[PDB]
Coordinates of C-alpha atoms and ligand atoms in Angstrom, one line a residue:
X1 CA -53.0 -61.2 -8.0
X2 CA -55.7 -59.0 -9.6
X3 CA -55.9 -55.5 -8.1
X4 CA -58.5 -55.6 -5.3
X5 CA -61.2 -53.0 -5.9
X6 CA -63.7 -52.3 -3.1
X7 CA -66.5 -49.8 -3.0
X8 CA -67.4 -47.7 0.1
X9 CA -70.7 -45.6 0.5
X10 CA -71.0 -43.0 3.3
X11 CA -74.2 -41.7 4.8
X12 CA -76.1 -38.7 3.4
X13 CA -74.5 -35.4 4.4
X14 CA -76.7 -32.5 5.5
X15 CA -75.6 -30.7 2.3
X16 CA -77.3 -33.4 0.2
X17 CA -80.4 -32.9 2.2
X18 CA -80.3 -29.2 1.5
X19 CA -79.7 -29.9 -2.2
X20 CA -83.0 -31.9 -1.8
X21 CA -81.4 -35.1 -3.1
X22 CA -83.0 -38.5 -2.5
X23 CA -81.1 -41.8 -2.4
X24 CA -80.0 -43.4 -5.7
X25 CA -77.5 -46.0 -4.4
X26 CA -78.0 -49.4 -2.8
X27 CA -75.1 -51.3 -1.3
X28 CA -75.2 -55.1 -1.0
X29 CA -72.4 -56.4 1.2
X30 CA -73.4 -60.1 0.8
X31 CA -73.7 -60.0 -3.0
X32 CA -70.9 -57.4 -3.2
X33 CA -73.0 -55.3 -5.6
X34 CA -73.5 -51.6 -6.0
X35 CA -76.8 -50.6 -7.6
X36 CA -77.3 -47.0 -9.0
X37 CA -80.8 -45.7 -10.0
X38 CA -79.9 -43.9 -13.2
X39 CA -83.4 -43.5 -14.6
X40 CA -85.5 -41.2 -12.5
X41 CA -85.9 -38.6 -9.7
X42 CA -84.2 -48.0 -13.8
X43 CA -81.0 -49.1 -12.2
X44 CA -77.4 -50.1 -13.0
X45 CA -75.5 -52.9 -11.0
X46 CA -71.8 -53.4 -10.6
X47 CA -69.9 -56.2 -8.8
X48 CA -66.8 -55.4 -6.7
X49 CA -64.4 -57.3 -4.5
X50 CA -66.3 -55.8 -1.5
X51 CA -69.3 -53.5 -0.9
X52 CA -69.4 -51.3 2.2
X53 CA -72.8 -50.0 3.3
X54 CA -73.4 -46.6 4.9
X55 CA -73.3 -48.5 8.2
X56 CA -69.6 -49.4 7.7
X57 CA -67.4 -48.8 10.7
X58 CA -63.7 -47.7 10.3
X59 CA -62.4 -50.9 12.0
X60 CA -64.5 -52.9 9.5
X61 CA -62.6 -51.4 6.5
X62 CA -59.4 -52.0 8.4
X63 CA -60.2 -55.8 8.8
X64 CA -61.6 -56.6 5.4
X65 CA -59.1 -54.6 3.3
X66 CA -56.1 -53.5 5.4
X67 CA -55.2 -56.3 7.8
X68 CA -54.5 -59.0 5.1
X69 CA -52.4 -56.5 3.2
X70 CA -50.2 -55.5 6.2
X71 CA -49.8 -59.2 6.9
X72 CA -48.3 -59.3 3.3
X73 CA -46.1 -56.3 4.2
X74 CA -44.5 -58.4 7.0
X75 CA -43.4 -60.9 4.3
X76 CA -41.6 -58.0 2.5
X77 CA -43.9 -57.5 -0.5
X78 CA -44.6 -53.9 -1.5
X79 CA -48.3 -53.0 -1.4
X80 CA -50.3 -49.9 -2.3
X81 CA -53.8 -48.9 -1.3
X82 CA -55.5 -46.2 -3.3
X83 CA -58.4 -44.1 -2.1
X84 CA -60.5 -42.8 -5.0
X85 CA -63.6 -40.7 -5.4
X86 CA -65.5 -37.4 -5.7
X87 CA -64.6 -34.8 -3.0
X88 CA -66.5 -35.1 0.2
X89 CA -67.2 -38.8 -0.5
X90 CA -64.9 -39.9 2.3
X91 CA -61.3 -40.4 0.9
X92 CA -59.5 -38.5 3.7
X93 CA -61.8 -40.1 6.3
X94 CA -60.6 -43.5 5.1
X95 CA -56.9 -42.8 4.8
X96 CA -56.8 -40.8 8.0
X97 CA -60.1 -40.6 10.0
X98 CA -60.8 -38.3 13.0
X99 CA -60.8 -38.1 16.8
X100 CA -64.1 -38.4 18.7
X101 CA -64.6 -34.9 20.0
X102 CA -66.4 -35.2 23.4
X103 CA -64.9 -38.7 24.0
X104 CA -61.6 -39.3 25.9
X105 CA -60.4 -42.1 23.5
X106 CA -56.6 -42.4 23.0
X107 CA -55.9 -42.1 19.3
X108 CA -55.1 -45.9 19.2
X109 CA -58.5 -46.7 20.8
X110 CA -60.6 -44.2 18.8
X111 CA -63.4 -45.7 16.6
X112 CA -63.0 -42.8 14.1
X113 CA -59.5 -43.7 13.1
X114 CA -58.9 -44.2 9.4
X115 CA -56.3 -46.6 8.0
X116 CA -53.1 -44.7 8.8
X117 CA -53.3 -44.4 12.6
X118 CA -54.5 -48.0 12.8
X119 CA -51.7 -49.5 10.6
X120 CA -49.0 -47.5 12.3
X121 CA -50.2 -48.7 15.7
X122 CA -50.4 -52.4 14.6
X123 CA -46.9 -52.6 13.1
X124 CA -45.4 -51.7 16.5
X125 CA -47.9 -54.1 18.2
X126 CA -47.5 -57.2 16.0
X127 CA -43.8 -56.6 15.5
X128 CA -43.1 -56.1 19.2
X129 CA -45.0 -59.3 20.1
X130 CA -43.0 -60.8 17.2
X131 CA -39.9 -59.0 18.6
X132 CA -37.5 -59.3 15.7
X133 CA -35.4 -56.2 15.2
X134 CA -37.8 -54.1 13.2
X135 CA -37.1 -50.4 12.3
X136 CA -39.7 -48.1 10.7
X137 CA -39.3 -45.2 8.3
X138 CA -42.3 -43.1 7.0
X139 CA -42.3 -40.4 4.4
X140 CA -45.2 -38.3 2.9
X141 CA -45.1 -36.6 -0.5
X142 CA -48.0 -34.5 -1.8
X143 CA -48.4 -33.8 -5.4
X144 CA -50.1 -30.5 -6.3
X145 CA -50.5 -29.1 -9.7
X146 CA -47.6 -31.4 -10.8
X147 CA -45.2 -30.3 -8.1
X148 CA -43.8 -32.4 -5.2
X149 CA -43.9 -31.4 -1.5
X150 CA -42.4 -33.1 1.6
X151 CA -44.8 -32.6 4.4
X152 CA -43.1 -34.6 7.1
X153 CA -39.8 -32.6 7.5
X154 CA -39.8 -29.9 10.3
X155 CA -36.7 -28.1 9.0
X156 CA -38.1 -27.5 5.5
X157 CA -40.4 -24.7 4.7
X158 CA -43.9 -25.7 3.5
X159 CA -43.2 -24.1 0.0
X160 CA -40.0 -25.9 -1.0
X161 CA -40.2 -28.4 -3.9
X162 CA -38.4 -31.7 -4.3
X163 CA -37.0 -33.0 -7.7
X164 CA -37.8 -36.5 -9.2
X165 CA -35.6 -38.5 -11.6
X166 CA -35.8 -42.0 -13.0
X167 CA -34.1 -44.3 -10.6
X168 CA -30.5 -45.4 -11.2
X169 CA -30.2 -49.2 -11.1
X170 CA -34.0 -49.4 -11.0
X171 CA -35.6 -47.6 -14.1
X172 CA -39.1 -48.6 -12.9
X173 CA -38.2 -46.8 -9.7
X174 CA -38.0 -43.1 -9.1
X175 CA -35.9 -40.9 -6.8
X176 CA -37.5 -38.0 -5.0
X177 CA -34.6 -35.7 -3.8
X178 CA -34.7 -34.5 -0.3
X179 CA -37.7 -36.5 0.7
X180 CA -37.4 -37.0 4.4
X181 CA -37.8 -40.5 5.7
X182 CA -38.3 -40.0 9.4
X183 CA -37.7 -43.1 11.4
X184 CA -40.4 -43.7 14.0
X185 CA -39.3 -45.0 17.5
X186 CA -42.8 -45.6 18.8
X187 CA -46.5 -44.8 18.2
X188 CA -46.4 -41.8 20.6
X189 CA -43.8 -40.6 18.1
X190 CA -46.2 -41.3 15.3
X191 CA -48.7 -38.8 16.6
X192 CA -46.2 -36.0 16.7
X193 CA -44.7 -36.7 13.3
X194 CA -48.1 -36.7 11.6
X195 CA -49.4 -33.8 13.7
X196 CA -46.7 -31.4 12.5
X197 CA -47.5 -32.6 9.0
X198 CA -51.2 -31.5 9.6
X199 CA -50.0 -28.1 10.6
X200 CA -47.9 -27.8 7.4
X201 CA -51.1 -28.8 5.5
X202 CA -53.1 -26.1 7.2
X203 CA -50.4 -23.6 6.1
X204 CA -50.4 -24.8 2.6
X205 CA -54.2 -24.7 2.1
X206 CA -53.9 -20.9 2.6
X207 CA -50.9 -21.1 0.2
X208 CA -52.7 -22.9 -2.6
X209 CA -56.3 -22.7 -3.9
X210 CA -58.5 -25.8 -3.3
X211 CA -55.4 -27.5 -2.0
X212 CA -57.2 -30.2 0.0
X213 CA -59.4 -31.0 -3.0
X214 CA -56.8 -31.1 -5.9
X215 CA -53.8 -32.5 -4.1
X216 CA -52.6 -36.2 -4.0
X217 CA -51.3 -37.4 -0.7
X218 CA -48.7 -40.2 -1.0
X219 CA -47.9 -41.7 2.4
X220 CA -45.1 -44.3 2.5
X221 CA -44.1 -46.7 5.3
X222 CA -40.9 -48.9 5.0
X223 CA -40.4 -51.5 7.6
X224 CA -37.0 -53.2 8.2
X225 CA -37.3 -56.6 9.8
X226 CA -34.5 -59.0 10.7
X227 CA -34.2 -62.8 10.1
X228 CA -33.3 -59.7 6.2
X229 CA -36.8 -58.7 5.3
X230 CA -38.0 -55.3 3.9
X231 CA -41.7 -54.2 3.4
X232 CA -43.3 -51.1 2.0
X233 CA -46.9 -49.8 2.4
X234 CA -48.1 -46.9 0.3
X235 CA -51.3 -45.3 1.5
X236 CA -52.4 -43.0 -1.3
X237 CA -55.1 -40.4 -1.0
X238 CA -56.1 -39.2 -4.4
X239 CA -57.2 -35.8 -5.4
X240 CA -61.0 -35.7 -6.0
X241 CA -62.3 -37.7 -9.0
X242 CA -64.9 -35.0 -10.0
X243 CA -62.4 -33.2 -12.3
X244 CA -62.1 -36.5 -14.3
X245 CA -64.7 -37.3 -17.0
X246 CA -66.3 -40.6 -18.0
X247 CA -57.3 -30.0 -15.1
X248 CA -55.5 -32.6 -13.1
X249 CA -52.5 -34.0 -15.0
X250 CA -51.6 -36.8 -12.6
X251 CA -55.2 -37.9 -11.9
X252 CA -56.0 -37.8 -15.7
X253 CA -52.9 -39.8 -16.3
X254 CA -53.9 -42.4 -13.6
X255 CA -57.2 -42.8 -15.4
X256 CA -55.3 -43.2 -18.7
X257 CA -53.0 -45.9 -17.2
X258 CA -55.9 -47.9 -15.8
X259 CA -57.7 -47.6 -19.1
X260 CA -54.7 -48.7 -21.1
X261 CA -54.0 -51.7 -18.9
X262 CA -57.6 -52.9 -19.0
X263 CA -57.8 -52.1 -22.7
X264 CA -54.5 -54.0 -23.6
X265 CA -53.6 -51.0 -25.9
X266 CA -49.7 -51.0 -26.5
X267 CA -48.7 -47.8 -24.7
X268 CA -49.3 -47.1 -21.1
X269 CA -48.3 -43.5 -20.2
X270 CA -46.4 -44.0 -17.0
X271 CA -44.0 -41.2 -18.0
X272 CA -46.5 -38.3 -18.2
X273 CA -47.5 -37.6 -14.5
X274 CA -45.5 -37.7 -11.3
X275 CA -48.1 -39.9 -9.6
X276 CA -48.0 -42.7 -12.2
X277 CA -44.1 -42.7 -12.3
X278 CA -43.7 -42.8 -8.5
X279 CA -46.6 -45.3 -8.2
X280 CA -45.7 -47.2 -11.4
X281 CA -45.4 -50.6 -9.8
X282 CA -48.7 -50.1 -8.1
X283 CA -50.3 -50.5 -11.5
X284 CA -49.6 -53.6 -13.6
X285 CA -46.6 -54.4 -11.5
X286 CA -45.0 -56.4 -8.7
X287 CA -46.8 -54.5 -5.8
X288 CA -50.0 -56.0 -4.4
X289 CA -52.6 -53.3 -4.8
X290 CA -56.2 -52.6 -3.6
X291 CA -58.5 -49.7 -4.4
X292 CA -61.1 -48.3 -2.0
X293 CA -63.7 -46.5 -4.2
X294 CA -65.8 -43.8 -2.6
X295 CA -69.2 -42.5 -3.6
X296 CA -72.1 -40.4 -2.5
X297 CA -75.7 -41.9 -2.4
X298 CA -77.5 -38.6 -3.2
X299 CA -79.0 -37.9 -6.7
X300 CA -77.1 -34.7 -7.4
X301 CA -73.8 -36.6 -7.4
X302 CA -75.1 -39.2 -9.8
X303 CA -72.8 -38.4 -12.8
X304 CA -69.9 -38.5 -10.4
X305 CA -71.1 -41.6 -8.6
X306 CA -71.2 -43.3 -12.0
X307 CA -67.8 -42.0 -13.1
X308 CA -66.1 -43.3 -9.9
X309 CA -67.8 -46.6 -10.5
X310 CA -66.8 -46.9 -14.1
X311 CA -63.2 -46.5 -13.2
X312 CA -63.3 -49.1 -10.4
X313 CA -65.0 -51.7 -12.6
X314 CA -62.6 -51.1 -15.3
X315 CA -59.7 -51.2 -12.9
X316 CA -61.0 -54.6 -11.7
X317 CA -59.7 -56.2 -14.9
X318 CA -56.0 -55.0 -14.5
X319 CA -53.5 -57.8 -13.8
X320 CA -50.9 -57.5 -11.0
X321 CA -48.1 -59.9 -10.0
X322 CA -46.6 -59.1 -6.5
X323 CA -43.1 -60.3 -5.3
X324 CA -41.2 -60.4 -2.0
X325 CA -38.4 -57.9 -1.4
Ligands
G7X401 C1 -58.0 -40.7 16.0 C2 -57.6 -39.5 15.2 C3 -57.2 -38.3 15.9 C4 -56.8 -37.2 15.2 C5 -56.8 -37.2 13.8 C6 -56.4 -35.9 13.1 O1 -57.2 -35.0 12.9 N1 -55.1 -35.8 12.7 C7 -54.7 -34.6 12.0 C8 -54.1 -36.8 12.9 C9 -53.5 -37.3 11.5 N2 -52.8 -36.4 10.8 C10 -52.2 -36.7 9.6 C11 -51.5 -35.8 8.9 C12 -51.0 -36.1 7.7 CL1 -50.1 -34.9 6.8 C13 -51.1 -37.4 7.1 C14 -51.8 -38.3 7.9 C15 -52.4 -38.0 9.1 C16 -53.1 -39.0 9.8 O2 -53.2 -40.1 9.3 N3 -53.7 -38.6 11.0 C17 -54.4 -39.7 11.7 C18 -53.5 -40.2 12.8 C19 -54.0 -40.4 14.1 C20 -53.2 -40.9 15.1 C21 -51.9 -41.3 14.9 C22 -51.4 -41.2 13.6 C23 -52.2 -40.7 12.6 C24 -52.9 -36.2 13.7 C25 -53.4 -35.7 15.1 C26 -51.8 -37.3 13.8 C27 -57.1 -38.4 13.1 C28 -57.5 -39.5 13.8
ADP402 N1 -68.5 -43.3 6.2 C1 -68.7 -42.1 6.8 N2 -69.4 -41.9 7.9 C2 -69.6 -40.7 8.4 N3 -69.0 -39.6 7.9 C3 -68.2 -39.6 6.8 C4 -68.0 -40.9 6.1 N4 -67.2 -40.7 5.0 C5 -66.9 -39.3 5.0 N5 -67.5 -38.7 6.0 C6 -67.5 -37.2 6.3 O1 -67.9 -36.4 5.2 C7 -67.0 -35.3 5.0 C8 -66.0 -35.4 3.8 O2 -65.0 -36.3 4.3 P1 -63.6 -36.5 3.5 O3 -63.1 -37.8 4.0 O4 -62.8 -35.2 3.7 O5 -63.9 -36.6 1.9 P2 -62.8 -36.4 0.8 O6 -61.5 -36.5 1.5 O7 -63.1 -37.7 -0.1 O8 -63.2 -35.1 0.1 C9 -66.2 -35.2 6.3 O9 -66.9 -34.4 7.2 C10 -66.1 -36.6 6.7 O10 -65.8 -36.7 8.1
CL403 CL1 -74.0 -33.7 7.8
CL404 CL1 -67.0 -44.7 10.8
MG405 MG1 -59.8 -35.0 1.1

């Protein structure tokens, strides 16, 4: 199962209007092509598993990319979904989403929901209707400046840092010490567990500079089903791609890993950055993986729009082989 790479273009921000930028990016959903106008203020075309226009709705993404994958979670296969791109291109919007402000929508009925709310809701829905003894445990670890933080725990201070060591009896696996896996009774529990985590994030933005921009958010869900069956979904929200070129250790390392795998060069540097070691099976491994790439249409972001694209195209080539748990 080759890694699924899919490109998502968001509408022009007011900031791009004020930078004067015109539109350099055309998204073709049918042909699944992205075309970038490099030449002037003539074009380059790329072909991805999916292409998502500026008109893409959150549920759309959920259906095309996420639903199939969660279906493969029920079978007990581990799966990872990356969200990659330049800051402000929409990575957090995809992984999380937002509430409609003047609307009365319940978070489960809200059009603006990103992948995480949606998935969490559905697991309870589908598996209640299935009704077979499921239990859910969700942890979230953010990597900043090569340090590990557990957001989810209430009892821990925002500052405290976990320790990671190569897994015993796994080797491929890694153990993050003191990472809280907080079992979820129900969705109305989901909202609280995530909400406190958002409060911790607000505290830690003040603690660290350009936190929101340089951090990697690794969200993990582990479902226990009876019959036994175990499934694990990693929703990863990467630090902005802009720092990367054609700084961030873990991000730079992720690029190196993708490059090595596509290249076929002998050494792939899993060891170097926390993200690659934790997410090691996500890359050239037994975990089914997809990548949502994110880009801006406006001309001023062109070098970045190209960089993002170059990674995804390259990452298309990489070979994955997923297996049931
Ligand atoms: C429909 C909706 C409503 C509020 C939000 C929102 O702003 N946040 C913050 C939600 C949110 N917070 C998160 C915090 C962390 Cl640390 C990691 C992930 C999330 C996340 O995914 N969300 C979205 C959400 C919404 C409803 C239920 C669960 C998750 C919380 C109110 C739950 C997002 C989507
Ligand atoms: N497809 C989209 N449609 C409308 N607004 C979007 C879309 N993608 C991103 N945005 C908005 O653009 C801004 C940047 O979003 P964010 O997801 O934080 O980017 P990133 O996390 O990649 O830096 C936010 O105001 C966000 O709500
Ligand atoms: Cl705007
Ligand atoms: Cl949307
Ligand atoms: Mg972000």
